[PDB]
Structure formats: C-alpha cells, structure tokens
A paper describes a structure:
Transcription factor (TF) IIIC, a six-subunit protein complex with a molecular weight (MW) of 624 kDa in humans, facilitates transcription of type 1 (5S ribosomal RNA) and type 2 [e.g., transfer RNAs (tRNAs)] RNA polymerase (Pol) III target genes. TFIIIC is composed of two subcomplexes, τA and τB, that bind two gene internal DNA motifs: A-box and B-box. τA binds the A-box with low affinity and is required to recruit TFIIIB to the promoter DNA. τB interacts with the B-box with high affinity and, therefore, is essential for target DNA recognition of type 2 genes. hTFIIIC consists of τA subunits TFIIIC35, TFIIIC63, and TFIIIC102 and τB subunits TFIIIC90, TFIIIC110, and TFIIIC220. TFIIIC220 forms an integral part of both τA and τB connecting the two subcomplexes via a ~550–amino acid residue flexible linker.
The cryo-EM structure of DNA-bound human τB enabled us to unveil the molecular basis of B-box DNA recognition. The 3.2-Å cryo-EM map of DNA-bound τB was of sufficient quality to assign 35 bp (55 to 89) of the DNA sequence. TFIIIC dimerization is likely to be concentration dependent because our MP measurements did not show clear indications for dimer formation at nanomolar concentrations. The observation that TFIIIC dimerizes under cryo-EM conditions should be treated with care because we were unable to evaluate TFIIIC110 dimerization in solution due to a limited amount of protein sample. Because TFIIIC also functions in 3D genome organization, one could, nevertheless, speculate that DNA-bound τB dimerizes at tRNA gene clusters and ETC sites, where it may help to stabilize long-range chromatin loops.
Author numbering:
A (entry chain B): 50 to 258, 271 to 590, 663 to 822
B (entry chain A): 1 to 240
C (entry chain C): 290 to 762, 785 to 890
DNA sequence: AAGCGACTCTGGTGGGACTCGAACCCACAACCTTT
C-alpha cells in the first residue's frame, strides 16, 4: 500500500522550528523554514496529463524587522538593559546576555526572524472561503496571514503588537488590584514582563456559530490569550476580543483545543501539556458565544511530572462501538512514547482511561499526526523510522496496535524532520534529509518534502462513492489517487464506473454527477488530450452532456429561489427570462418541477424586458449559451457560473481549477444572492475565490 | 488561461524593459493560444483600464522612443523534398529591441535587463490615482507619451511568469543567470539558441554562457534540445 | 587599569583578572554547589570484587615500563641520567619544584580530578584511562566494546609540607568490559565525604561519583569509596595492584522501554554534568551528533528500570540533534544552567538554550575543534583547534564571545600542532593546552568583559609549562628503541624577564615557524590537560599523553596570597562544619 | 617624560565565483577507397 508519489519537493532553506510540517483542511502543506514558510498547494489538475502531484508553490516571507517585546518605556528599558549587561554578578549578567528573548538582535548574534511554528485555521476563516495561516517567528512575532490573490501572502494582523500594547496599557497586570506596578529594574519583574508575552505555540478552535473562530496563544509563563475573530477575518477590525486565562502550568510546552458533543450538548476546553510532563485540560471559563458551553472543572490526564516533554497533542472524535456513544481520543507525544487518553461522557460524567503505548522508537518523537477520520496515529523520529499506530476498540476504552513503515524501502537511508497526513488519510508527507550512509555522515544536507500513498486506489474509489461529506474539494487527496490511476491506465476501472452508475441511478444527487464529470475529464486527459479521435469526440460529448446536466440543476435552483423571495421586478441581477427561455428551450428533459416553476415565474415576470447590456456598446446580450455572451459588435463577456450575469467587471473570481467563474457580490445585490454567490463552484466544488 | 490574465501575463513576459503600447497589441495578436477578444479600439480601452487599475503594473517614460518589434518567426517550416524542414530561417538581424544591460546587485532584489533603468521616470501616479482609478484613456496616454510610455509588471509578477505555478518563488538566481531566463521568457514559444545568446545577446565566451546556464538546468527551469540552423550557405548548423 | 608590577613579575593589569576570579568562583560555589547529594548512591563492599592476578591480566595496559626519559629544569644543573619507571609507578617529586611523573602503561585518553569541598584538605586523586595498546587506533564510526581499566591515582594532599618527596600512588582500578573511555567527569560537588565517616560494615565512605563515556555507546556511573575503606575489607595478602570488577550505580544509554530497535547514536564521545545544585542532569554527546540528557534521580517507570543485578538502566528524558556530524565536546554553563555549548566535527560551535532546543542561541562556524572550556566569569568559550583547516600561521587557541558583547575572537595563543586538550582554571582564570608538538602552555585571559582588541601584545600573557622532545638514542617499539623523551620544564617560580628567558624564546621559535613531524608515532604528543578544580591544590595541573607518562606541575607564580587567604578561611569554616 | 585606548597602516589567506584548457560532438565536403 505504501509507495512513493513521484515529485519530491526541494526546499531552498533549512527547516526550522517546532513540528515543522502541517497539512491543512484546504490541502495546502506548509513547512516552516529559516527564511519563509513554503506552502505546497495540491491541485487535482484537470487540464494536464502529467501523473505527478500538481503542487503549486507559494511562500510567506520571513519578516525584515526583528521584534522587540515591549516591557516598558523606550528609555526605561534601555537603562535597565545597560544595568543588567554591566552587572558584576555572573548569574544576572550571563542570564541577560545569553537569553535571546531579551536580545532579539545584536552585534554578533544571528537574527531569529525565521519561523518557530505555524498553524492552519479551519476553512471559511479567510475573506475568501479559504483558511487562514497563523505564523510565529522565533523572535515571537505572531502574525495571521492570508492569500487573497493566488500569488502573494499578506499579513492581516500582528497579534504580538496588539497584545504588547494592551499589556502596557494595563501596566502588565491582569487583575489591577492583584499586584503592584513592580519595578522594571528588578530582573525577576523584567524577566516576567518578557515571559508573560513570549508565545510558545498556538491553535485555532473550530468555527463557533455569524461565524467566529477562537485562537489560543500559549505563553512561557502559562498565561493563555484566547483571541476571538469575527468571520470572514479581514484584519484588526475582526478581532472581537482578547482574554487571558492563567493556566498556572509551569513551563507549558504544547496546547490543543478540545471540542466535543454529547446528547447534542456542546462542550469544550483547552488541553495543555507541560514540558515537565503532565497533561491537563483547562475549562475555558471565559467566552462570549452563547451556543457553546465549557467544561466545569479541570481534569488531569497525566500527573506524573516525569519531565518527558509533551512535544505534540492531537485528538480525534470517535464513536465507540461497545459503549455505543461518542467519545474523544487524545494522543500526546511524550519523549519517545505516545500517551493516549480516551474521554467519554456518560451518566457518571467523564469516564477516563489512559496509557502509554510503548516501544515505538529509540529516540524522542519529533512529530505526530492524527487521521481525523479513523484516529490512526503516525509518529516519527530523526532516525527515519515512521510508525503507523492503529486504535483498536476494546470492550472498555482502546488498545493500540502499531507497525513500522519502511521508509528505507522507498527512499533509502534517510532522516525525517517531520510528517503530515492528508485530510482523508490519502497521503503522508515527510520532510526527508540525507541519512547516515553505512555509518558515515552525509557530506551535504538538503531538506525535501516527499509523499507516500497511504491508501490503495480501490479504497480511495470506494470511500469517494460512500463519502459522507459529499464534496470533492474536501477529498482532493482521494480523487488524486483516482486521478493517478486513470492517467496511468488510460481507462476508468470498470467497477468504479458500474458502482457510480448504480449510485447515480439510485440516488442521483449532484455530488455523483460531479464525480462522473471528474472521471470523464481525467479520462479525456489520459488519452493524449481515426478511432482515438472518435473516442475523444465520444467522451467529450459525454462531458458536455453531464456538464449540461449540472448547469440545469443549478439554474433550476436559482430560479427555484427567485420564486421564493420578493419578485425582483427590475430584473436587477439575474437574467431571469433568459434562464426561463434556456430551460424551456428543449423538451428533451421532462422535469415538470422546472417546467411549472418557469410557468409560475413567467406568469409573474414583468412584460417589461429589462435586458442586459454590453458595457462597450449599451446593446443587448441575447443569452444564447451557458459560458459566454456576445453582441453585434463582437465583444465576448464570460457569464458568472453562479448567477449567469455577465462578468463585465475588470476583476472577477475564478475557480481554483479555473474550470469555473464567478462574479463579485455588490451592495446592490440582495442578501439571498450575496449568500448564493458564496456557493462553491457547481462543477468542481473548489473555491471560486 | 483567462483573457484578463493572458494580458497581464504578456506584460510580465517581457522583461524589466517592458512594453510600448503598440508592442503590447502586437504581442496579444501574435499570442498562442489565441487571444480571446477581437482587440477592437473599444476593447483596447477596456484592456488599458485593466492595466491602469492593476496595482502590480507600473508605467515609465523612457528618454527615447523604442523600436517596433519584428516578425519574430524563426523557422522555415516548409520543404520541397518529402516532409518539411523546421530549421531556423534567418530574418534580418535588425537592431535589437531589447539589448542586454543587466541590473546587477540590486538592493531591492529586482533583476533583469534594462538599458534605461536608472534614467526613466515613474509616471504611475500621472496615469492613475493612488486609489487605482485610471486618470487617462489609452488614446490620451499614447498621444501624450507615444512609444516613450513603457509598461512593466512587478518583479513578483515577472518572476512568476518565468517559473509558472509549480515553480518555487524562494529561489534566487544570479543576475546573469536570471537575465538568461528573462531572455528566454520574452521569446515565448521560439526560444533563443544558445549559440545566439553568447554570440550576440550577451556577447561572451561560450564557457560563460554555459556556466551561467548550469543553474537554470540544475533547478530545471529550462529545457534543452539540439536544433538546426539552415545557413544561406545551404549547409546547416547544429546549435542548442 | 591598575599600574605597576606584581611580585611574580607580571604587570598588575595582567594579573588582576586572576585575582578577581578567586572571589567570583568562591561566591558561585557557596550558592550553587552543595555538601551532600545522591544520598542513596553510596559504595557497598559486596559490589567491589577484587580480581586475582590471573583475572586482572587482560585489563592492565600492556606496556610494563615507560619509555626512557630525562627531565631538565630551567636554571638547574643538567641531570643527564635517563629515568625509566614501571607501569603503575612514580618518580619522586623534585625537592624544589615538586613536579611528579608517573606511568600508566598506555596512551592517556581520559583524565579528571576528583572534586573535594573547599577547605577539606583531603588527599587529592585523579581518575584516568590509558588505552590498552600504544599503537592500535580506533575508528569513530564503530562500537569498540573491548576491555579497559579505569585507574584512580592518589597525588597526596599537595600541601606545601607534603610536596617534597611526594609520589603518586595507584590506589585501585576498575576493570571495565565496555571498551575504551573517551571522557571522564566527576559529579561537581556533594559527592565527597570525610573518610572517617562512621558507616556500617557493608557501606564505605564515598569519594566521588564518576561518569564514564564508553566507546560502546553508553555512559557508566560509578560511586567511588575512599581507598582505606576498601583495603580494610580487602584481604591483607592481596595483590598490590588492586584491580576490582565493580557494578555500576547506573548504565546510561539511549533508547526506550521495550524499544528493541538499537539506537543509531553510536559511540558516546563527551560528557557534561549539570554544573549547579543538585547536579541532577547528566548530558552526553554522541557520534551521530545528538546531545542526550538523563534525569539521574528519576523514579519514573518510563525512564528507569532496575536490572536483575540491582543496577539501574536509565533512558534519556530529552535528546536533540545538535550537530550534523560527531559532537566532540560539551560545556555546560555554570552561571546559568539553562545554557549549554557544544562543538562538533562539522566545525560549528553552537550555543544552546535547553528550554528552547529547536534553534541554537548562536552558531559560529569555525575550524575543527577538539575541546572547549567555559570559564565561569566570562560569557564566551575558549576553543582548541585541530589545525587541518586553519590558515597556516593562524592556527591556535581562540576565545569566542557568545555574542552579546560582539567582540571578535581573541587569538590567545598561536600553536603549530593541533591542541588536543584544554582546561580552564576557574580559580586562576587561566587556561592550559596540550599540543601534538608535545608542548604544554598556559595563558592568562584578559577580563573578557572588556574588548580584547586593546590587548596589544598577547604574548606577554602566555608561557610554556614544559615541552617534550624526542632525542635520538611509525610504531612504538621502533620509536622507543631509538629515542628518549627530553622533558624541558619552565621555572614556574616567577615570570621575571619572561620574554628573554630561553623557554619563551624556544616557544616563540616554535610558534609560526616550526614544522610538524609525521614520520613518527607522535610519542611526545600531549592528549589531556586538567587544572585542579579544588581550592586546595587550585594551583596544580596534571597532563598526560601518547607516552603514557602523566606529569603534575605546580604553577607557583599564579598561586597567590588571596588563594592562601581563602584557603585558610575556608579551612576554618570547614573545620567548624565537620569534625 | 612615561603611559594608555582608540584609530589606523601593513603583509597574508580563504570563500565562493569564475576563468581556464581540454576533449567531445555536427554535419558537411573531400576522396580516398572499394568491387
Ligand atoms: Zn459590445
Ligand atoms: Zn470550478
């Protein structure tokens, strides 16, 4: 099952920071590196025959200016820094001069502007339908990044800048009665004012219901700042609150969100793990949203303080077959071991079980990933071992069974600096480096990202047919396995065709028509893009037929909403009569529901024309055809594939696959089409941006 | 590729030397795949607004009017014997529109060839407001500046046009190696011959061109073929 | 800047940092050492089994007698005799100058002073390892796992009244089946107690805790009894080389519970104890470049297991890939133990913050380095180079600031050969370094809070201790049969007229111009150098090398009234605390 | 005067980039080369 996928991705700069590889729900892979964040965007390319992974590459630049954590007045801090560095005590003086938090830049110190950590938001956080990237530098600049156009990442906000000012405005006191304004000239208070705002790691919540998302930032002193962002996130404008909770955990290493549901009651908390070993779930006692609620009291998952640093945390929702109820499985990397804890609400409240699955590695675990759909864990160490670790349900709680996957057999002797798993578990991505060659060191070090197939084509095909999520973009990594097979064998495997026809016959929801359209477009590319010409014409005819079907279903739904809201007698933003004419144009499709709907509409429609005009002419556009409109002067305007209005604006939206086009919403548009314009592309479910 | 992107792509496939307005229309008319619009005078105003409203495009007045482009078509593509010969059939080597003058060691990291890079002046804020509203029509712009109006895409757009979507933006190249890549880019479908690059584009030792070309091969930004030049001697020459 | 000349003949502005370092080191140890640690790890007589003569024979280093040598001492009449001494034997100290020389039977590759609390006035010991064979040489990439002997040598108490007529005594050794030892480190404090401590017959008073970096890839931790307590248990007629087979307190090795997969880490190359109370962490550097930390007290079932013999096996709590090549040397920061430095054969020096191991505080690429010293009062580290990549005439010894002060590297001493080993005296603020040229030098650093570029003539701050020459008379026997070692010793009694005295001219004609010799065994080469960490004997130094001779020197000119002042006040305080 | 801490002034080497010298290769005309 595990075999390499063809393109290795070369990295220009050293891999950098904590747990440096991640794979977003949006199929963008980020590697945090000394001079950038490289982002690898996986495209199920339907326009080319190449069997490789089509990886579009972008990067976030490293900052040009080093970040100073604000601890006082610009002069007050300067005299303090002189005092400590000049101190004749070896301890005070060397503690100041060695710790890079106090010294983010210097005369002979390398600048720490590369990236410490990165976290991907859920989808829908961006101004487009996409996810945001939270990025942390090693000089503690925490920033939120988005790729609004395709080409260039822009910083939306710097959260360290805001939080520094908000601490300064409260004299670094969280409760104003609780502490003095301690003198900055005391090294303990000086260190504290740095420690209280040095971010360790951060994680996004799920989407809270108007949408909202939280971001929890963990600080070295055990404070956590819970940011609340309004969605879509557009900058400082969307920051609805910041609230700091004092965890009290000493030397906190890692953070993750716990979110859980039982009896449709929502609950949530923050799980936090110390570098000194223990793991605890905090109740998030403060939040503004009304639909969620929070855990009542902290629960201790591991108490031992054995100083095995909790390097990573992941958790997955599960349904336990024998307890016959939903439960949450937590897995945490602790040194070379995996700690696991299963959390199960019952009539007793929380029932909790835990263990260490042991003997996995002879070196500490350098990265960990959870297969969200199964709880399959992967774990990795710099000796190049990767171990697949399968949760098996037990009459109470779990057992874990595990196996090594031989990267030696696919890449040879290799070092692995990180792993990530695709959102459906289709691929494992690995940061490979030159390994020890028969006990010799490699002379030259070159980081790469490499991919291996975790699933067979037959399992990817089956899981797409039985897909509960029923959106192709949620499953680009599975349809890429299907794509690879079709391009490799230049035919659609018969069992997939037969099963898909059975689904289209027995269910026929537009997801299966979208899946058919994908297979046929990849088939067309496979056969070199006159029996071959006859076959090309045949399957292109089939593509056009199913492409036409998906169009009718969308047009029917649009008119099936024009009929429901107040009649737009001015015909303001939809070519209603043109669409009615287009639907009535043939008797070939018998669907009475459309034919009566256009009856009711055409009864209600105004006798005034309200035609669409070509802006270069102020002459009518007839609405002859799906894709584009033309006028007597010969201008050609594309039509918005969501609303069929002509995209005459100098900027308009394009699908991720460029298979489809959409208009930008305007203030003249009613709310209901401003919502309609947020639909994914009707042909490929990709963001239309 | 979309029509509006195919415009901005063509502006970015010329180097840092950019385009004149008549050169731009010539580039769109000679494009492959074909440009979707008929490029009528009203359309040229629409496309001009698409440039002026785009924040990455920028506009300059150069000290002197640029020559117009030749018919670039390099190859014979016919034979009287069986088949056809697609060997190079030499046009007149008229004065090059884009002589090589590399922008070395630039502090902003922008790279390419431009003979007037220090001498031309920005007129972006004359052609558009800082709110990106266009201040001039195309006919007003060409009336006021003629061929002295030069259109240049931002470095980020220009470098993207050389590496495509699968290419890695983090890769810096030496200025000489970038200027080789840029000299390829503006040739579109009919790449420069390595013979011609060292003989007359860069005017260097073949060892120098090979050496600086190495990095483009190593990172895989370019593709190598043997090709054939049919001389007026009737004999025909091998070149890369 | 303090004017005038010290009575030892150095300028006061050159000596003034040395005098300051006494107070700074005393103030540190009062705060961050302790009088007792690891109270469970105490020696038991039944864990020390005495080997018979027949059983010890595989372990003893194989040369039964030293090379012939003679020692010439500056300004004395020439001796002219050739000495030769048996394995495990010592010449008598010279009556004026108290240098002692003893022979260990093989090339010395590890060496440390047994640390003793201030004022104790104890007997002073060195623990050392000398390889079994003079000419065999071991690859880095492979585990060795052979036999070897850990040797403990008593030097006497090194009081002024004790030094005339002193001799080194081989008190005992431990026969190890764990290959050669590449590093030795004692627990910095709290390991030693009075030999008169009343303990029940199974127990023995504790001399120290000693960690061994073994060439088979693990660290071994021993608790050492005082010799008299062993000899009281030992039979009276026993063999005079006391060779014991001893159970470890713990074996420290990389791995995990039930993880049968053998670690790639390879040989253990270097050690550092945590400099500060309670010394609970021990670090090691490995051939694969990882730095590995063990939490010595750990009860946790995930780190500690007890073997059937009752010894511990400890797995690490933290490891990280410090270097892309063998990490040859570690130093752990005394002033704040959140920080550590390492250097590896990628020829980078990397400073680490152990709270944040993902990126070093500072990486400086340099020449290939053999050992580091981190003197307590100075923020930077002094580095000994292997010459193979340095520009000719610029190879030597460099002090390098960790980076905040931003000074250029300070070229403390040019050396022609590779400096094999380096030791900084915290008490003296001086540094000593051994060369394949067979020369031992010492150097006084300036106060490195102040910019070194003002040090307009560094040569006034360095002096030779001795140089070994081969005098005619590729393998050991062919070299020994045809050469003898002329040791030339400096008059360390004072540094008057230093730059005109012949040992300095000899050294200065060595520096820069002399050519390295490669058609011989390098029999003169010095491999380890160690200043005493103890306040008693603080002015003493030990060194040894390819000859398997080990030599002790008192740097009388750097011993000082403040050291005497501090020794007596510490004696009084110690005598009040323990009686 | 004698002394000090910047501020220079002087010979020497390496780091990465790049000139260097060589064989290797095209396709043609010359014709030696063959039944
Ligand atoms: Zn028109
Ligand atoms: Zn689409």
């Amino acid at each position: 099952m595990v075999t390499r996928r063809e393109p290795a991705v070369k990295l220009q700069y050293a891999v950098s920071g904590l747990e440096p590889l991640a794979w977003s729900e949006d199929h963008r892979v980020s590697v945090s590196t000394a001079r950038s964040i490289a982002v690898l965007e996986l495209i199920c390319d339907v326009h080319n025959p190449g069997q490789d992974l089509v990886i579009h590459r972008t990067s976030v630049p490293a900052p040009l200016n080093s970040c100073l954590l604000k601890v006082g007045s610009k002069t007050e801090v300067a005299e303090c820094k002189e005092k400590f560095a000049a101190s004749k005590d070896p301890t005070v003086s060397q503690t100041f001069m060695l710790d890079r938090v106090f010294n983010p830049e210097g005369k002979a110190l390398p600048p720490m502007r590369g990236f410490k950590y990165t976290s991907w938001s859920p989808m829908g956080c961006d101004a487009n339908g996409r996810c945001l990237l939270a990025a942390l530098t090693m000089d503690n600049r925490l920033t939120i990044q988005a790729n609004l156009n395709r080409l260039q990442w822009v910083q939306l906000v710097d959260l360290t800048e805001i939080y520094g000012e908000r601490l300064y405005e409260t004299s670094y006191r969280l409760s104003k009665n609780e502490a003095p304004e301690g003198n900055l000239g005391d090294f303990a208070e000086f260190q504290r004012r740095h420690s209280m705002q040095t971010p360790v790691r951060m994680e996004w919540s799920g989407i809270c219901t108007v949408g909202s998302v939280l971001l929890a930032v963990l600080f070295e002193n055990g404070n956590i700042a819970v940011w609340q962002f309004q969605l879509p996130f557009v900058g400082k404008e969307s920051i609805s609150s910041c609230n700091t909770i004092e965890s009290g955990i000493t030397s906190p290493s890692v953070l993750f969100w716990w979110e859980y549901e039982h009896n449709n009651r929502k609950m949530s908390g923050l799980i936090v793990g110390s570098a000194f070993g223990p793991i605890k779930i905090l109740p998030v006692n403060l939040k503004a949203v009304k639909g969620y609620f929070t855990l009542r009291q902290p629960v201790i998952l591991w108490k031992e303080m054995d100083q095995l640093p909790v390097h990573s945390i992941k958790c997955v929702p599960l349904y336990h077959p024998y307890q016959k109820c939903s439960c949450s499985l937590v897995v945490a990397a602790r040194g070379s071991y995996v700690f696991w804890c299963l959390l199960l609400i019952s009539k007793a409240g929380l029932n909790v079980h835990n263990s260490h699955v042991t003997g996995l590695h002879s070196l500490p675990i350098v990265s960990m990933t959870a297969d969200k759909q199964n709880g399959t864990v992967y774990t990795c160490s710099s000796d190049g071992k990767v171990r697949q670790l399968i949760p098996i349900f037990t009459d109470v709680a779990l057992k874990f069974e595990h196996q090594l996957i031989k990267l030696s057999d696919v890449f040879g002797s290799v070092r692995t600096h990180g792993i990530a798993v695709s959102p459906c578990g289709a691929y494992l991505a690995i940061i490979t480096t030159e390994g020890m060659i028969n006990g010799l060191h490699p002379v030259n070090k070159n980081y790469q990202v490499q991919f291996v197939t975790l699933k067979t084509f037959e399992e990817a095909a089956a899981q797409l047919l039985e897909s509960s999520v029923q959106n192709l973009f949620k499953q680009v990594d599975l349809i890429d396995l299907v794509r690879w097979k079709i391009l490799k064998d230049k035919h659609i495997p018969q069992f997939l065709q037969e099963a898909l026809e059975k689904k289209i016959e027995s269910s026929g929801v537009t997801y299966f028509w979208r899946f058919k359209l994908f297979l046929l477009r990849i088939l067309y590319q496979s056969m070199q893009k006159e029996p071959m010409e006859e076959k090309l014409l045949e399957i292109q005819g089939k593509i056009e037929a199913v492409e036409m079907h998906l169009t009718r279903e969308h047009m029917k739904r649009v008119l099936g909403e024009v009929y429901l809201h107040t009649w737009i007698t001015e015909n303001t933003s939809i070519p209603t009569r043109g669409l009615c004419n287009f639907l009535m144009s043939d008797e070939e499709y018998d669907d009475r529901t459309a034919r009566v709907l256009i009856g009711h509409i055409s009864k209600k429609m105004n006798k005034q024309t309200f035609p669409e005009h070509c802006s270069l002419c102020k002459e009518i556009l007839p609405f002859t055809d799906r894709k584009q409109a033309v006028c007597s002067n010969g201008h050609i305007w594309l039509r918005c594939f969501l609303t069929y209005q002509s995209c005459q604006s100098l900027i308009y939206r394009r699908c991720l696959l460029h298979d489809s086009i959409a208009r930008h919403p305007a203030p003249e548009d009613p709310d209901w089409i401003k919502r309609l314009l947020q639909s994914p592309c009707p042909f490929c479910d990709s963001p239309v941006f | 590729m979309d029509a509006l992107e195919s415009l901005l792509d063509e502006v970015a496939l010329e180097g840092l030397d950019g385009l004149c307005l008549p050169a731009l229309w010539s580039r769109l008319e000679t494009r492959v795949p074909p440009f979707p619009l008929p490029l009528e005078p009203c359309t040229q105003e629409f496309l001009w607004r698409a440039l002026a409203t785009h924040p990455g495009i920028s506009f300059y007045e150069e000290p002197r009017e640029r020559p117009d482009l030749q018919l670039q078509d390099r190859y014979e593509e016919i034979d009287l014997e069986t088949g056809i010969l697609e060997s190079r059939r030499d046009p007149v080597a008229l004065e090059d529109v884009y002589p090589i003058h590399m922008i070395l060691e630039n502090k902003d990291g922008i790279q390419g060839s431009c003979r007037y890079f220090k001498e031309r002046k920005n007129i972006t804020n004359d052609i558009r407001t800082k709110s990106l509203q266009p201040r001039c029509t195309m006919v007003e712009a060409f009336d006021r500046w003629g061929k002295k109006l030069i259109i240049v895409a931002s470095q980020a757009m220009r470098y993207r046009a050389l590496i495509g979507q699968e290419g890695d933006p983090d890769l810096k190249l030496p200025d000489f190696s970038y200027c080789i890549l840029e000299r390829l880019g503006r040739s579109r479908w009919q790449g420069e011959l390595q013979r011609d690059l060292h003989t007359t584009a860069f005017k260097v030792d073949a060892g120098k061109l090979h050496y600086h070309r190495k990095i483009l091969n190593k990172n895989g930004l370019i593709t190598m073929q043997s090709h054939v030049i049919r001389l007026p001697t009737g004999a025909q020459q091998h070149s890369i | 800047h303090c004017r005038g000349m010290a009575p030892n003949g150095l300028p006061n502005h050159i000596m003034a940092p040395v005098w300051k370092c006494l107070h700074l080191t005393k103030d540190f140890r009062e705060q961050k050492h302790s009088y007792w640690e690891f109270a469970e790890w105490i020696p038991l007589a039944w864990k020390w089994h005495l080997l018979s003569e027949l059983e010890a024979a595989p372990y003893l280093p194989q040369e039964e007698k030293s090379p012939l040598f003679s020692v010439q001492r500056e300004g004395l009449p020439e001796d002219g005799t050739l000495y030769r001494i048996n394995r495990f034997s010592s010449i008598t100290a010279h009556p004026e100058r108290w240098d002692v020389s003893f022979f260990t039977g093989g090339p010395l590759w590890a060496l440390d002073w047994c640390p003793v609390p201030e004022g104790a006035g104890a007997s002073q010991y060195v623990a050392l390892f000398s390889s079994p064979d003079m000419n065999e040489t071991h690859p880095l990439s492979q585990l060795h796992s052979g036999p070897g002997l850990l040797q403990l040598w008593g030097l006497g108490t090194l009081q002024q009244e004790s030094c005339p007529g002193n001799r080194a005594h081989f008190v005992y050794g431990i026969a190890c089946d764990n290959g050669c030892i590449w590093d030795l480190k004692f627990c910095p404090s709290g390991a030693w107690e009075l030999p008169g401590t009343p303990r029940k017959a199974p127990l023995l008073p504790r001399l120290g805790l000693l960690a061994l970096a073994c060439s088979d890839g693990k660290v071994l931790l021993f608790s050492l009894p005082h010799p008299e307590a062993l000899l009281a248990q030992q039979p009276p007629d026993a063999v005079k080389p006391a060779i014991y087979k001893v159970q470890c307190v713990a074996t420290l090795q990389v791995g995990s519970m039930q993880a049968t997969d053998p670690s790639e880490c390879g040989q253990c190359l270097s050690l550092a104890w945590m400099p500060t109370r309670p010394h609970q962490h021990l670090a090691a550097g490995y051939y694969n470049g990882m730095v590995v930390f063990w939490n010595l007290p750990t009860n946790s079932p995930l780190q500690r297991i007890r073997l059937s013999d009752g010894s511990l096996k400890l797995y690490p709590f933290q490891c990280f890939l410090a270097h892309d090549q063998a990490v040859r040397t570690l130093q752990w920061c005394k002033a704040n133990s959140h920080f550590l430095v390492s250097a590896g054969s990628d020829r980078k020096i990397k400073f680490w913050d152990l709270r944040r191991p993902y990126e070093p505080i500072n990486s400086i690429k340099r020449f290939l380095s053999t050992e580091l010293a981190w003197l307590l009062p100075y923020n930077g580290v002094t580095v000994a180079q292997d010459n193979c990549y340095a520009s000719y005439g610029l190879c030597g010894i460099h002090y390098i600031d960790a980076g905040y002060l931003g000074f250029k590297a300070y070229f403390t001493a040019p050396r022609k050969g590779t400096v094999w080993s380096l030791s900084g005296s915290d008490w003296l603020g001086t540094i000593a370094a051994g060369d394949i040229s067979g020369e031992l030098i010492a150097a006084i650093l300036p106060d490195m809070a102040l910019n070194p570029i003002n040090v307009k003539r560094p040569v006034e701050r360095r002096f030779p201790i001795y140089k070994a020459d081969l005098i005619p008379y590729r393998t050991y026997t062919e070299t020994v049969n045809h050469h003898y070692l002329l040791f030339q010793d400096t008059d360390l009694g004072s540094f008057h007229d230093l730059l005109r005295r012949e040992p300095m001219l000899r050294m200065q004609e060595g520096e820069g111009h002399s050519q390295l010799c490669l058609d011989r065994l390098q029999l003169e080469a010095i491999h380890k150098v160690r200043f005493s960490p103890n306040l008693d004997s603080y002015g003493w130094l030990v060194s040894g090398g390819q000859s398997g001779l080990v030599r002790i020197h008192f740097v009388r000119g750097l011993a000082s009234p403040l050291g005497h002042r501090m020794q007596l006040e510490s004696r009084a305080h110690f005598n009040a605390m323990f009686q």
